[model samples]
Target: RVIRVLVVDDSAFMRMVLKDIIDSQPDMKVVGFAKDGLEAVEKAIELKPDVITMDIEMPNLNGIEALKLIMKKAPTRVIMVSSLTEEGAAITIEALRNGAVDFITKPHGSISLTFRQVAPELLEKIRQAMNVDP
Candidate 1:
């Protein structure tokens, strides 16, 4: 079965990038997009996607806070995408605590070193996350 996913980010480019990245996977498909955390929550309730690729910063709410809200409503899986900077890493960790299944480094561009971080191992991580009770 296809794992429906939502890409949540303020940047259109980021959303498109995430779509291309996830589209490379056979088991997953992008079902929706949200420009910010508030929109993410609103659409999430409506779409009920299986997975979320969430960004840390947004307009109405932040990714971590939106994650907590999503968890309270549903037990869907989430994979946060953040930059490689120290602050980004810290927020990603906090998202894990808030129940994100895993995370992928924000790719530098269409192709980047950070993409190296999102290997098959990361795909495995997302797969494992799908089975998590959270």
Candidate 2:
């Protein structure tokens, strides 16, 4: 079976960007598109996706909060993602401290990070996370 992915981002464009990136891969399939931190947690437990792509900043809640909650409740692998460089940078370290497997920094603009830049590393990170002993 393909690896299942739960994508969490507040912006619809960002969510879709990740969705497209995950869907294009043959080994990993996207299972859910969550538009905020709260929805991410809801979908993480309910969907039980193998990996979660968590955004650091959002309206309802933040990625760190959602990351800890998912770890507490379902114990799934998470990849923290963000575009707000300074703040996103700070939380990247914090998210790892809170149990995020890794972090992906989006480009400075509205998804200036296109498929060419996003594909290999994102997929590789998910593969690396899956390689951990459960």
Best candidate per lDDT, number? Answer: 2
lDDT by residue for model 2 (75-118), tens: 88998777642334666677877888887767565355463475
**Which candidate should be chosen as best, given TM-score against the real structure?**
2
| TM-score of candidate 1 to 2 decimals | 0.81
Per-residue CA lDDT of model 1 for 1-134, tens digit only, reads 78788889888876776677777899988899999999888878889998887887788898888899998986688888766323346676688888888887665743344554565655676667778767
**What TM-score does each of the candidates earn?**
0.81, 0.89
Q: After superposition, how far is residue 59 of candidate 2 from its true place, in Å?
A: 0.7
**Root-mean-square deviation per candidate:** 3.1, 2.4
lDDT for 43 (candidate 1): 76
